[PDB]
């Protein structure tokens, strides 16, 4: 029953704006503070913003002060994050999160029901925001051609696409055993790259054919490549 | 602005063992203005502790935390599988509220050497005018592994990037790729290409290599 659902994610160019929304349900929304937290690629958690139960007290991470505004609508149970003048460094998963349902004054008196944003006990699944000037592009798929630990290995190098994601399968998709597809790396060019690999018996190379099926919907690309020893 | 520094960076433990996580604050924070979170890939972070030492709803008594001043700790008394994840401290003594950089608690298993493979640039990629050399380290444990590239025996620096999978859910191993990126012009200028791998499961470093065009 208790849930927070985010929406508004997406690709925006630098200097652009984007608005994130979080709908709360299954709890008394008006009593709680709320905040936003983000996690950039390969980075840790970063506190972005928070506002208290009646939105009177709102505060910001140093890196977003000025550009970002948090608001709430206690009538329809939404909290928002208005993000302006977006930068490449703002690329991240953004999480909406529920704050406390109390607060404490300088005198140490605790106020039940007057929530604020000290810490977060309920988290949205998060929405992805990508800030880049890169043009949508489909991947080049190159074979990685074939012993160690008893087997051979082969794969596909899926290079220079934008945006994420891609998906990889092998021999149409019946082959999952021993397949590793690596996390994408953003290259200097601002395009992504990854490899997909799979280990196979050395004797079986000649008998069976290996093809990787690469799909990149953003650019509606589909490519199948054979890897030959 | 308060900077939180967690240590150690990673712990390799097994169910039933104790994990102790530490967080140094760059300025004194009062004992009651601290929280801890647990975060596994693909899932929302989860609150464990607030108020320095108070367990969040649903959190069992095996988690405990405390501290004051410039050091705070979280202890997991006896680890279970779901406890392998990244853990973050968070201070709310002073705005802006901030998080530590995370400490990973990962599964300890028996040593497993990498199976190591090297792939030269394909003909296709070459025709298209770029050159990538890939070194694969497959299914190994522990995580620590040094990969060094040599081109005509000259050690390479600054022109490779490593990517690593999450610890495997079935066998708790890692796989890793190291990708050396060269202009086609430079690739063509040299002959021998080599990936040298050092790892606990190998009796000595292993080198995979090829000669361009052979």
- Transcribe A67-135 into DSSP letters: TEEEEEETTTTEEEEEE-S--GGG-EEEEEEE--SEEE-TT--EEET----SS-SEE---EEEEE--PP
CA B57 to centroid of chain Cα atoms:
30
Backbone phi, then psi, for A54, in 5-degree steps? -105, 15
Name the residue among B76, B66, B62, B57 with its Cα closest to residue B29: B66
A interface test, pick of B45, B46, B111, B116 with most A CB neighbours within 10 Å: B45
Of B98, B117, B125, the CB nearest to A142: B125
Does the CB of B214 have a partner CB in chain A at under 8 Å?
A: no
Of B100, B122, B175, the CB nearest to A143: B122
CA B129 to centroid of chain Cα atoms:
33
Q: Chain B closest CA to A215's CA: distance in Å?
A: 19
| Sign of CA pseudo-dihedral B189, B195, B196, B198 | positive
Q: Are A162 and A134 in contact (CB under 8 A)?
A: yes
Three-state secondary structure readout of chain B: CCCEEEECCEEEECCCCCEEEEEEEEEEECCCCEEEEEECCCCCCEEEEECCCEECCCCCCCEEEEEEEEEEEEEECCCCHHHCEEEEEEECCCCCCEECCCEEEEECCCCECCEEEEECCCHHHHHHCEEEEEEEEEEEECCCCEEEEEECCEECCCCEEEEECCCCCCCCCEEEEEEEEEEHHHHHHCCEEEEEEECCCCCCCEEEEEECCC
* Helix or strand holding residue A168 (H, E): strand A167-170
Rounded Cα gap, residues B178 and B196, in angstroms: 11
Backbone phi, then psi, for B125, in 5-degree steps? -55, -40
> What are residue B39's DSSP bridge partners?
B86
Nearest CA in chain B to A229: B119
Domains and their CATH numbers in chain B: 1-109 (2.60.40.10), 110-212 (2.60.40.10)
Nearest CA in chain A to B38: A45
Rounded Cα gap, residues B81 and B62, in angstroms: 13
Residues 150-179 of B with CB under 8 A from A: 161, 163-165, 175, 177, 179
CA B2 to centroid of chain Cα atoms:
25
Q: Is A35 helix (H, G, I), strand (E, B) or coil?
A: strand
Note the resolution in Å, 1 decimal: 1.9
Instruction: Tell how strand B103-107 and strand B10-13 pair up.
Output: parallel
Torsion of CA A81, A87, A89, A94, to 10 degrees: 20
Rounded Cα gap, residues B156 and B172, in angstroms: 31
B interface test, pick of A46, A108, A116, A142 with most B CB neighbours within 10 Å: A142
Nearest CA in chain A to B102: A44
Domains and their CATH numbers in chain A: 1-133 (2.60.40.10), 134-229 (2.60.40.10)
Alpha carbon separation from B24 to B67, B70, B90, B158 (Å, rounded): 10, 5, 11, 32
Name the residue among A133, A154, A159, A130 with its Cα closest to residue A144: A154
Does the CB of B93 have a partner CB in chain A at under 8 Å?
A: no
B interface test, pick of A39, A45, A116, A138 with most B CB neighbours within 10 Å: A45
User: Could you tell me which residues come within 8 angstroms of residue B126 by beta carbon, excluding any fewer than 6 positions away?
Assistant: B184, B187
Q: Chain B closest CA to A16's CA: distance in Å?
A: 25
Yes or no, beta carbons of B122 and A60 under 8 Å apart = no
Name the residue among B57, B26, B166, B108 with its Cα closest to residue A181: B166
Rounded Cα gap, residues A141 and A161, in angstroms: 10
A interface test, pick of B53, B86, B96 with most A CB neighbours within 10 Å: B96
Residues 3-32 of B with CB under 8 A from A: none
Name the residue among B73, B12, B15 with its Cα closest to residue B48: B73
User: Could you tell me which residues come within 8 angstroms of residue A2 by beta carbon, excluding any fewer than 6 positions away?
Assistant: A25, A26, A27, A122
Residues of B in contact with A194 (CB under 8 A): 163
Residues of B in contact with A224 (CB under 8 A): none
Yes or no, beta carbons of A159 and B164 under 8 Å apart = no
- Around Cβ A162, how many Cβ atoms within 10 Å? 21
Yes or no, beta carbons of B44 and A157 under 8 Å apart = no
Could you tell me if residue A149 is left (phi over 0), alpha (psi between -120 and 50 degrees) or otherwise beta? left
Nearest CA in chain A to B103: A44
Q: Chain A closest CA to B63's CA: distance in Å?
A: 16
Does the CB of B44 have a partner CB in chain A at under 8 Å?
A: yes
> What are residue A80's DSSP bridge partners?
A21, A71
Q: How many residues does chain B have?
A: 214
Yes or no, beta carbons of B35 and A95 under 8 Å apart = no
Residues of B in contact with A159 (CB under 8 A): 125, 130, 132
């Amino acid at each position: 029953e208790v849930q927070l659902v985010e929406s508004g994610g997406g690709l925006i160019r630098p200097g652009g704006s984007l608005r994130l929304s979080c709908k709360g349900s299954g709890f008394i929304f008006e009593n709680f503070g709320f905040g936003w937290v983000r996690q950039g690629p390969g980075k840790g958690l970063e506190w972005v913003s928070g506002t208290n139960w009646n939105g009177g007290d709102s505060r910001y991470g140093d890196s977003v002060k000025g550009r970002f505004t948090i608001s709430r609508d206690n009538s329809n149970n939404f909290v928002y994050l208005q993000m302006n003048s977006l930068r490449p460094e703002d690329t991240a998963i953004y999480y909406c999160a529920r704050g406390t349902d109390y607060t404490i004054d300088d005198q140490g008196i605790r106020y039940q029901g007057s929530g604020t944003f000290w810490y977060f006990d309920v988290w949205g699944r998060g929405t992805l925001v990508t800030v880049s000037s890169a043009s949508t592009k489909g991947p080049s798929v190159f074979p990685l051609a074939p012993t160690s630990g008893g087997t051979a290995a082969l794969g596909c190098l899926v290079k220079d696409y934008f945006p994420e994601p891609v998906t990889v399968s092998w021999n149409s998709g019946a082959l999952t055993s021993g397949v590793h597809t690596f996390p994408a790396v953003l290259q200097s060019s601002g395009l992504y790259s990854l490899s997909s690999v799979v280990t196979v018996p050395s004797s079986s190379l000649g008998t069976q054919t290996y093809i990787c099926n690469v799909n990149h919907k953003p650019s509606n690309t589909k490519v199948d490549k054979k890897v030959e020893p | 602005e308060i900077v939180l520094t967690q240590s150690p960076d990673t712990l390799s433990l097994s169910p039933g063992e104790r994990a102790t996580l530490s967080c140094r604050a760059s300025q004194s924070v009062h004992s009651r203005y601290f929280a801890w979170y647990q975060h596994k890939p693909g899932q929302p972070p989860r609150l464990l502790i607030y108020g320095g030492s108070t367990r969040a709803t649903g959190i069992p008594n095996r988690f405990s935390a405390g501290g004051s001043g410039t050091q705070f700790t979280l202890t997991v008394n006896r680890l279970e599988a779901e406890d392998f994840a990244v853990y973050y401290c968070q201070q709310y003594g002073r705005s802006p509220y901030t998080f530590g950089q995370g400490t990973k608690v990962e599964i300890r298993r028996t040593v497993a050497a990498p199976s190591v493979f090297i792939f030269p640039p394909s003909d296709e990629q070459l025709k298209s005018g770029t050159a990538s050399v890939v070194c694969l380290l497959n299914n190994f444990y522990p995580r620590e592994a040094k990969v060094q590239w040599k081109v005509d025996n000259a050690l390479q620096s600054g022109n490779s990037q490593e990517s690593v999978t999450e610890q495997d859910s079935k066998d708790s191993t890692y796989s890793l790729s190291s990708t050396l990126t060269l202009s086609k012009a430079d690739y063509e200028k040299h002959k021998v290409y080599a990936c040298e791998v050092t790892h606990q499961g190998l009796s000595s470093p292993v080198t995979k290599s090829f000669n361009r065009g052979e």
